Amino acid sequence: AVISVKPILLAMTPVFILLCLFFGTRNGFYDTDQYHGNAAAH
Amino acid sequence: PLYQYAWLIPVLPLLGALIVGFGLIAFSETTSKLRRPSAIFIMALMAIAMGHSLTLFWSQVQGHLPYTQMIEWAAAGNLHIAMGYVIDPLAALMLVIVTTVAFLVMLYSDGYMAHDPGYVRFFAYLSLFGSSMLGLVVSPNLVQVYIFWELVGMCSYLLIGFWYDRKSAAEAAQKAFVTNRVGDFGLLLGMVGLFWATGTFDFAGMGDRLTELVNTGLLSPSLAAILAILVFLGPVAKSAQFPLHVWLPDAMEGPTPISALIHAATMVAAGVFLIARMFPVFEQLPQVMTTIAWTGAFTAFMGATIAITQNDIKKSLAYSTISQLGYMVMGMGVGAYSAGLFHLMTHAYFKAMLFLGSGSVIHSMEAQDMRYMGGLRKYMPITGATFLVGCLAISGVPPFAGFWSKDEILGAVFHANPAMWLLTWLTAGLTAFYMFRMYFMTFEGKFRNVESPWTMTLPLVVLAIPSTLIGFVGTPFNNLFEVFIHAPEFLILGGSSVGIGLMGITVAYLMYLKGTPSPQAIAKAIQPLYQFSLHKWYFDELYEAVFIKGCRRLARQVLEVDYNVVDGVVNLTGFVTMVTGEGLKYLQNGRAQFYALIVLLAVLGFVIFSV
Amino acid sequence: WLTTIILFPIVAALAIPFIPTGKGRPIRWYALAVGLIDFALIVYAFTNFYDPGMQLWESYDWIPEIGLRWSVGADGLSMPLILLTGFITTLAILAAWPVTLKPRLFYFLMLAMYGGQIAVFAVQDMLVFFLAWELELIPVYLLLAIWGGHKRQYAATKFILYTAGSSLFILVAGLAMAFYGDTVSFDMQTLAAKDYALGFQLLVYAGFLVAYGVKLPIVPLHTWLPDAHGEATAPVHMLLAGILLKMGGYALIRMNVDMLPAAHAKFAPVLVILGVVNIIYAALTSYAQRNLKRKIAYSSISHIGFVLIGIASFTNLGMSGAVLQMVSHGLIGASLFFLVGATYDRTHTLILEEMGGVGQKMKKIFAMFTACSLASLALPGMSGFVAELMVFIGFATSPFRVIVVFLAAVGVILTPIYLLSMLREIFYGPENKELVEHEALVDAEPREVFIIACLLVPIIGIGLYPKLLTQIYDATTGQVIARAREVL
Amino acid sequence: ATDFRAIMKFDGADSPAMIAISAVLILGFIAGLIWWALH
Ligand SMILES: CCCCCCCCCCCCCCCCCC(=O)OC[C@H](CO[C@@H]1O[C@H](CO)[C@H](O)[C@H](O)[C@H]1O)OC(=O)CCCCCCCCCCCCCCCCC
Numbered sequence A: 001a002v003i004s005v006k007p008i009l010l011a012m013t014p015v016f017i018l019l020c021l022f023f024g025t026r027n028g029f030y031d032t033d034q035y036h037g038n039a040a041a042h
Numbered sequence B: 001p002l003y004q005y006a007w008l009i010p011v012l013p014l015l016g017a018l019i020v021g022f023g024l025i026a027f028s029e030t031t032s033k034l035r036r037p038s039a040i041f042i043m044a045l046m047a048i049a050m051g052h053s054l055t056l057f058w059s060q061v062q063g064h065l066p067y068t069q070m071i072e073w074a075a076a077g078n079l080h081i082a083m084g085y086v087i088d089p090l091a092a093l094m095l096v097i098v099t100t101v102a103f104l105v106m107l108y109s110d111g112y113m114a115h116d117p118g119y120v121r122f123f124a125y126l127s128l129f130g131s132s133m134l135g136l137v138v139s140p141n142l143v144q145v146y147i148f149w150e151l152v153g154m155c156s157y158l159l160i161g162f163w164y165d166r167k168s169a170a171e172a173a174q175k176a177f178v179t180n181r182v183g184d185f186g187l188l189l190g191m192v193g194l195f196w197a198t199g200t201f202d203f204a205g206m207g208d209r210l211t212e213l214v215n216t217g218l219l220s221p222s223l224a225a226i227l228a229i230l231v232f233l234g235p236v237a238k239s240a241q242f243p244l245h246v247w248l249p250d251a252m253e254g255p256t257p258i259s260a261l262i263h264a265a266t267m268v269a270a271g272v273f274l275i276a277r278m279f280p281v282f283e284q285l286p287q288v289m290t291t292i293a294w295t296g297a298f299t300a301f302m303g304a305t306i307a308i309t310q311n312d313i314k315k316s317l318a319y320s321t322i323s324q325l326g327y328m329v330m331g332m333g334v335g336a337y338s339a340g341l342f343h344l345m346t347h348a349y350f351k352a353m354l355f356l357g358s359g360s361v362i363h364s365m366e367a368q369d370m371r372y373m374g375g376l377r378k379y380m381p382i383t384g385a386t387f388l389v390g391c392l393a394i395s396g397v398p399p400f401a402g403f404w405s406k407d408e409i410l411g412a413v414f415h416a417n418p419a420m421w422l423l424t425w426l427t428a429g430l431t432a433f434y435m436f437r438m439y440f441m442t443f444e445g446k447f448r449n450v451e452s453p454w455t456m457t458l459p460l461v462v463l464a465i466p467s468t469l470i471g472f473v474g475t476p477f478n479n480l481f482e483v484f485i486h487a488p489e490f491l492i493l494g495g496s497s498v499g500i501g502l503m504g505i506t507v508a509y510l511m512y513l514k515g516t517p518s519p520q521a522i523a524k525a526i527q528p529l530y531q532f533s534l535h536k537w538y539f540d541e542l543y544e545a546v547f548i549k550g551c552r553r554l555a556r557q558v559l560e561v562d563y564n565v566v567d568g569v570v571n572l573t574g575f576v577t578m579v580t581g582e583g584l585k586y587l588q589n590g591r592a593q594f595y596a597l598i599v600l601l602a603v604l605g606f607v608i609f610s611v
Numbered sequence C: 001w002l003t004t005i006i007l008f009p010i011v012a013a014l015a016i017p018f019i020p021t022g023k024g025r026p027i028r029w030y031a032l033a034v035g036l037i038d039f040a041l042i043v044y045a046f047t048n049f050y051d052p053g054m055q056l057w058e059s060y061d062w063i064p065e066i067g068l069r070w071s072v073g074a075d076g077l078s079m080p081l082i083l084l085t086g087f088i089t090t091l092a093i094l095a096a097w098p099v100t101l102k103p104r105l106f107y108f109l110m111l112a113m114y115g116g117q118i119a120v121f122a123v124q125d126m127l128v129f130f131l132a133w134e135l136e137l138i139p140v141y142l143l144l145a146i147w148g149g150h151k152r153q154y155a156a157t158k159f160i161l162y163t164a165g166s167s168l169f170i171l172v173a174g175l176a177m178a179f180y181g182d183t184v185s186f187d188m189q190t191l192a193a194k195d196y197a198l199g200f201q202l203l204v205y206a207g208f209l210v211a212y213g214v215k216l217p218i219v220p221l222h223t224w225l226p227d228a229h230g231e232a233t234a235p236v237h238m239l240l241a242g243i244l245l246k247m248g249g250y251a252l253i254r255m256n257v258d259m260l261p262a263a264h265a266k267f268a269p270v271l272v273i274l275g276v277v278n279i280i281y282a283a284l285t286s287y288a289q290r291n292l293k294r295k296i297a298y299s300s301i302s303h304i305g306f307v308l309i310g311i312a313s314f315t316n317l318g319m320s321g322a323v324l325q326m327v328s329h330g331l332i333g334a335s336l337f338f339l340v341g342a343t344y345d346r347t348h349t350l351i352l353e354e355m356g357g358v359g360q361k362m363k364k365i366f367a368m369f370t371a372c373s374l375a376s377l378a379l380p381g382m383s384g385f386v387a388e389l390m391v392f393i394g395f396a397t398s399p400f401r402v403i404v405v406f407l408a409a410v411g412v413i414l415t416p417i418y419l420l421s422m423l424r425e426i427f428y429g430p431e432n433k434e435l436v437e438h439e440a441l442v443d444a445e446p447r448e449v450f451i452i453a454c455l456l457v458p459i460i461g462i463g464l465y466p467k468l469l470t471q472i473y474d475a476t477t478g479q480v481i482a483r484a485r486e487v488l
Numbered sequence D: 001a002t003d004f005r006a007i008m009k010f011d012g013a014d015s016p017a018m019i020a021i022s023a024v025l026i027l028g029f030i031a032g033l034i035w036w037a038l039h
């Protein structure tokens, strides 16, 4: 027998999209607690 | 039935750690303050594994043939890769050893770890260790004896570097990883060779194919021997044998429960475990058995000589277990397949007892030095008594198991190559000496410089029961260990060991208890071999001098070649096509007459090579 | 499908210049939604992807006067990498939240080089291949030169110069194979089915090699990499190190093993000794380098040698080891350079001896970084080891292949040297004094942990049951290597 | 160069002479091996 990636992907990627949009909101250090910088490395 | 969900054994602890891992990353504060229920959860997982392994061991001693259930892991056109499990009796034995020691030590470390950050990460690491080693044991083939054989190495890296606040633990973990990656280099070359030559990796076909090919030509005699010692170069790193021994004692900067698993017959045993499951590559090669045997012998003499002059208890037990691993590797070398594992099954118990007692006393020391802990046992009855039992185990006094182990191996060494006897014999004397000065300096006398839990002490008794009762499954009148573990009158020999052990314990009694000789002036005098063997046989300084300097200088030797001889050559292209532009513009000079020249004289050359 | 996949990010990127704002917040959500929708298009066009050849190809005609055709094509050899870019560029965008300096240009160029990275795999025309190979220059140039680094001047200039002057023989070679005979092919398949004489097979081969060995940096064709990957922020770097090197490796496979096999059989030992040189060279230069990022860049240079060896073998296993290594390093190095960027953001420092014991307060990045570091080296249970093992097995199964294995296995010892020394130098030990008064970053906001967890799930799922990634191209790689052995 | 100031503190490694007689060994090593490989 053999296992296929197709239903695995179909089950994972909606969760990925939703959690991506969710954890986009959850944030921290970069907002105000520190980090006067601007994401440039100079 | 069982034997179908045997793959379930590594998965329950792992799963536990996995969950708890997702609990240490996400929801950190809860799982950091949720200390004991996670502990007993992981303990329940390991207990299910222990019961499962015990039922397998009982069904296998009762009677059955092995049941392997493999699966194709990595595929290609013609060849294949298999990765599953087999359950032979040796695997069940090592499995039950791992599970019992891990359960008892997890209970122990419920008490060793006081109010302390890292009480759950510890058990996560330790359950990952359980999964890794339990999966190493259940292995039909060799590729799966590299996967878990390195997962256990990284888990040792983690456990050693638990107290990342410190500096010595970091260096120790780096060292104990790099040395095992040298071992990986060896075993990886060996695996790739044994696949290049034979065409399979199953520990049984690998011997049939080798003897078949060597009956014909196509590789011999040292073209089947170079890729058989490389396989042995893994255990040399993982079982701490000569010359890759420096990593083990420096791994004692980590905690004591850790140092009790990965110095019992749980991790370092993996080396000899490999040597057990590869005798159908070594039996048809007497050119390397000798190498293995003398390696183990020199390791034994090393670890016996270094531990005497040490004063740190844990760092002394390190060289002790190195020596006992040397005895086992010796037994592996000269023939004996069912006598090295007896010492293994005995050494996974009393050495763990000694480490756990060391953890108890060093925990009740408010350190770590035998010179600054005098007569205990006025407040440490249980720990002292059980330490004493484990101390009797690793020496003569025949009712204890270690005599029944270090009599079979010595008999095998005497019947075959007795020259290697009379060095191992005095080495057993040295064992009897250092292990009893470790007691007379530590649990008897007057408490020199300047009190025992319950959870921390039950495991010591539960392991004292084996360490007194394991010897009686050997005993060559009704030997059951040799019949259940097979490879694919004696008083003149045995009593000599007890007599030499009596010499050792007597010289230790009259020298550290009262000290009618001069322990200081025997070394504060002409004798310089206290400095030597207290600088631990300068190997450490040797490697730190010639090897660590080598790569560290070669890296610059290459990098400046990179930044100058390679980079400058191409930046020179930009320089050239820049200075060309800087110097060609002078052709343009701001003169109409110069154009009048190089307009019509710019041509009239185009007529000369034309007609 | 592929045309929608390539043009929707670019077309939707042209909306950003007229998109409301008060400070710069609603741009990144738009970019992320575009990336996620396009990844959904990938995985939904992957349902109708049966698993030997182009399982879907949509041709058209722009210029019949040359031979230029918009010949998109998926394949077993090109679909994993399409998935990889669609996932990892999305996560770069999900890593580039704090970008406040010119975010419009950021999330325009990032989406432009999101179609400029799926196109190079979903293209079968040798002129459009050149087009898509070339259009990574200006976006990467601006991504390096504006935000990221102090030496970014020299880095970006050197990048664009070398990846133009060595994006140079690709067109020449496509032409040189296009008009050998009496057919103006300009197509992968139609041009692989032609009989090329040895006298210029091994010349067009070197033409391909000068291009495919600077982006897949080999012996000296690497000096752009430390400067372009050192002076670069994290989300830029995830793309630059996880896709473009894979672009070089992919194009090397498809243009030098299906299309010049007779010269491949004669030059492959060169690739092999070059690969082991690459490993040892990069590992030593990484253990010597002290900053923080150049180290991991040389680690990437080290890890590419397995690809060189696996392609320069000739069995059905080394090729899969190469592709598995590619999909592995794309997932590993991304998390590594992300964590390096984060550590710099919290410390405002890269140099190692200038910081220590930071893992007492910043004790969330330490675990994630330790895990990705264990994943860098050939640790079992992960895809970094399956690739190495398959490379060793497949190559040895085929320069009297016993010395080169001995030299390539030195990496097994030599990778943890600098990785664990880096960990020791940074996170272990006692906390620094007030010399580090940057307030140790509030340990990885959940948003970083999600990035690395979603990069660290697929890698373990591969390392345990690798066939998941190998089910994709067992057929295509089988046909390729059957061809390349049929010649010999 | 002056940037490489750490435990990597070997003095006689940045000089042009030592760089030359190091690059000689490295280039000759790869060259001996490419000749070994072709033939
Ligand atoms: C369906 C298939 C399932 C199979 C899955 C297979 C993969 C298995 C993964 C299991 C992972 C088990 C390890 C979990 C331990 C996590 C510890 C943790 O997060 O500490 C996180 C700790 C959190 O800190 C802890 O909690 C509190 C936090 O405030 C305290 O303050 C202390 O920090 C400490 O108590 O971080 C640190 O403070 C110290 C970090 C130490 C470094 C740990 C890195 C270890 C990473 C090992 C990962 C190896 C995995 C790859 C190998 C895969 C093998 C197959």
Ligand SMILES: CC1=C(/C=C/C(C)=C/C=C\C(C)=C\C=C\C=C(C)\C=C\C=C(C)\C=C\C2=C(C)CCCC2(C)C)C(C)(C)CCC1
Residues within 6 Å of the ligand: A005, A008, A009, A012, B018, B021, B022, B025, C083, C084, C087, C367, C368, C371, C449, C452, C453, C456, C457, C458, C459, C460, C461, C462, C468, C469
């Ligand atoms: C999407 C995608 C993919 C994938 C797929 C697959 C392959 C899957 C698999 C999957 C699987 C089969 C799963 C498994 C699972 C596992 C897990 C779940 C584990 C791990 C995780 C975790 C748990 C983590 C955590 C952590 C962190 C985060 C940090 C550090 C520490 C730790 C580790 C703890 C691919 C690659 C194709 C491509 C791209 C896209």
